[PDB]
Design a protein around this ligand. Structure first.
Ligand SMILES: Cc1cc2nc3c(=O)[nH]c(=O)nc-3n(C[C@H](O)[C@H](O)[C@H](O)COP(=O)(O)O)c2cc1C
Ligand SMILES: Cc1cc2nc3c(=O)[nH]c(=O)nc-3n(C[C@H](O)[C@H](O)[C@H](O)COP(=O)(O)O)c2cc1C
Ligand SMILES: CCCCCCCCCCCC[N+](C)(C)CC(=O)[O-]
Ligand SMILES: CCCCCCCCCCCC[N+](C)(C)CC(=O)[O-]
Lengths: 116, 118
């Protein structure tokens, strides 16, 4: 019971950008593997959802950076608790993209037909 | 009183999960969760179930007893149980992310047809 898990949800900045998501992914993947932080970040449809677990001080501090990040707002901690055993293997990223986010990147589906 | 709890778990979907199984889970859950006033959501993606459930402590603990011994998934890991003042979900629903490999496991395929229109 010498570790914590932390779980929060937040709302993306409405002007969040691909670059932003790309910065968050890259930063996230590298610091967490180094701080021994295990868990998962999900982004779908303007909402973030994240689990983190590890040393209490390493979680307490990554959450400190996260709670002041202007890339999201309304950071709502859903579960904080002493764990004795990590319940996630390393760090997992899962970003899903709807048609809305697609039209909202200038992107569209297109079928290619080539004469062969 | 009318205090409420929230429980969240992840699990591994049975390798041999079938469309019938998903039909059963959805029909059963919808019917019982409405009767027992359990709100939340079940997610399926790339072999994993994740469920969020809310309601009265006895109603959540009861459904979790059943969920935990259900042979349609294994490795049920409770991730959070927390007191809540209010529900974050209005009702209940299942959300499924369906891959090419999901399709083929269920013995299904899409086929496209071309159709004249105005
Ligand atoms: C939704 C969201 C999730 C994030 N998740 C992580 C993460 O798990 N690990 C991490 O090191 N930084 C994460 N960050 C980025 C940090 O808030 C922050 O940019 C990073 O710790 C570097 O801080 P610094 O700019 O003061 O050096 C996340 C940011 C957002 C908006
Ligand atoms: C991943 C998964 C999620 C489930 N979620 C619920 C649920 O939210 N509510 C529910 O009543 N049963 C749920 N069940 C079904 C129960 O485990 C159990 O089969 C049911 O309560 C008893 O069904 P019966 O009355 O038809 O015998 C779930 C099962 C699985 C495999
Ligand atoms: C019982 C209700 C059956 C509904 C079938 C819907 C599942 C379709 C999945 C198709 C997967 C194709 N992928 C994901 C690759 C996208 C595409 O090619 O358009
Ligand atoms: C009763 C309404 C019929 C809707 C058609 C859904 C087709 C899904 C494929 C089923 C696989 C067997």
């Amino acid at each position: 019971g010498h570790m914590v898990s932390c779980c929060y949800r937040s709302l993306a900045a409405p002007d969040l950008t691909l670059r932003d998501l790309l910065d968050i992914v890259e930063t996230s993947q590298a610091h967490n593997a180094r701080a021994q932080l295990t868990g998962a970040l999900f982004y779908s449809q303007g909402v973030f959802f994240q689990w983190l677990e590890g040393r209490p001080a390493a979680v307490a501090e990554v959450m400190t950076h996260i709670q002041r990040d202007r890339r999201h707002s309304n950071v709502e901690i859903l579960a904080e608790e002493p764990i004795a055993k990590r319940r996630f293997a390393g760090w997992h990223m899962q970003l899903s993209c709807s048609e809305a986010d697609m039209r909202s990147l200038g992107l569209a589906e297109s079928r290619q037909i080539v004469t062969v």
